[PDB]
């Protein structure tokens, strides 16, 4: 089943959605804010859920071993950064530590380039599973490199200025035409990740 639920005026107080939530293993709930921003698709990555994350591990361990770990990391980044945003929108970004700035900025990068998906262009109309996994790897490794680099001396403003090229590369990785096949798209992502790691190693010093 894929049972669309028109949310009506209410968000989830409508008894049809409440009665459905107790049955459906997967619930890609709408996000009003992402719709008002015209951020498509506009599903809410904080109240949606899939009771199928753990059963699929039998499939992930055979094909994409790191997929569940990467998904958990992605969720952790998004949730920590939504917590952080709920405060910074109330106070301001001046007091944020460098790690806090990285979490917030990588969350913005994710929410704008991974989660967001046009769905109409020839690229990204249907993002296959291997391309999605490789972009998960790229974004998570970018966050890991930023966090590790600022665990060392390098302050993050200069680091962002110096690795804007790497940030743009991981942001435009979505543009990779999936019709090129995994054989070469995965090669592109391997090249991207290697250049990412070497650039962050260079800019650390």
């Amino acid at each position: 089943i894929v049972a669309a639920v028109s949310p009506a005026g209410g968000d989830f107080s409508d008894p049809v959605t409440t009665a459905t939530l107790g049955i459906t293993q997967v619930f890609w709930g709408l996000d009003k804010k992402l719709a008002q921003r015209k951020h498509f698709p506009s599903i809410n990555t904080s109240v949606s859920y899939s009771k199928y994350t753990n059963v699929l591990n039998k499939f992930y361990d055979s094909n994409y071993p790191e997929f569940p770990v990467l998904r958990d990391r992605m969720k952790e980044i998004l949730s920590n950064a939504e917590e952080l945003e709920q405060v910074v929108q109330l106070v301001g970004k001046s007091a944020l530590s460098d790690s806090d700035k990285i979490t917030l900025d990588v969350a913005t990068l994710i929410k704008e380039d991974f989660l967001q998906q046009n769905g109409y262009s020839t690229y990204d109309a249907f993002c296959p599973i291997w391309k999605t996994f490789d972009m998960m790897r790229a974004f998570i490794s970018y966050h890991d490199e930023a966090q590790k680099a600022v665990a060392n001396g390098a302050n993050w403003s200069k680091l962002a200025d110096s690795t804007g090229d790497v940030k743009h590369a991981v942001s435009s990785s979505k543009f990779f035409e999936p019709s090129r096949g995994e054989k070469e798209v995965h090669g592109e992502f391997e090249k991207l990740l290697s250049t990412m790691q070497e650039r962050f190693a260079e800019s650390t010093d």
């Binding site: 753990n54 969720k75 944020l96």
Partner: protein, 228 residues
């Protein structure tokens, strides 16, 4: 509950009865109520919701004479994540506490996503002491809750006064909160932790702090459990 009453009173064995998703049971009770052409009470649930919830919950507890005892853990789904809903409200109005599972922790990948700050067991202090579990269990629980609250509010302030302006207590509390949420609360789905072993982890977690900063724990317990 009838099977539990049998096993626990007519025989003697204890029993920890589980009632999964009592919210769905309430949903079915709505259908029964509307079948009888009864008018809906509050929120659509029948007005006697409390009576037919109590006649389930209160079929549990130890008994004078018979050695057995029924322990209920009635699990129920928050309809829209609000305590004010009739079902969570009535269940917390009949039961002896609450053990939250929190969306916020579950989105971080934690398992189980137990939210300790609101969860409480009213009569926990009966099941804690020298005879049952170790003698430090009560003070370990108290101190863990206190330091977790300190960690949560100091994690809130990290974004306000910066990390460097937090008192050393709050810095240690952030470190403790990270290690806590990621190693103590975070438990493998199939990892059975004996209460003694879980208390050992709790002690290995609280010895972040110096003995003086563990104000909540009685000194007679610190002087024999902090170092080991």
């Amino acid at each position: 509950l009838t099977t539990a009453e049998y096993l626990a009173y007519q025989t003697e064995r204890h029993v920890l009865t589980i009632l999964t998703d009592m919210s769905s049971y309430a949903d079915a009770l709505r259908e029964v109520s509307a079948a009888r052409e009864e008018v809906p009470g509050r929120r659509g649930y029948p007005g006697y919701m409390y009576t037919d919830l109590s006649t389930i919950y209160e079929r549990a507890g130890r008994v004078e004479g018979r050695n057995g005892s029924i322990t209920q853990i009635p699990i129920l789904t928050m309809p829209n994540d609000d305590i004010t809903h009739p079902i969570p409200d009535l269940t917390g109005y009949i039961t002896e506490g609450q053990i939250f599972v929190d969306r916020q922790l579950h989105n971080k990948g934690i398992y189980p996503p137990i939210n300790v700050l609101p969860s409480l067991s009213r009569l926990m202090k009966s099941a804690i002491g020298e005879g049952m579990t170790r003698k430090d269990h009560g003070d370990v629980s108290n101190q863990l809750y206190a330091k977790y609250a300190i960690g949560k509010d100091a994690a809130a302030m990290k974004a306000v006064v910066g990390e460097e302006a937090l008192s050393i207590e709050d810095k240690l509390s952030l470190e403790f909160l990270e290690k806590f949420e990621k190693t103590f609360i975070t438990q493998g789905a199939y990892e059975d932790r004996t209460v003694f072993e879980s208390l050992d982890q709790a002690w290995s977690l609280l010895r972040i702090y110096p003995k003086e900063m563990l104000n909540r724990i009685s000194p007679k317990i610190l002087d024999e459990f902090y170092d080991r």
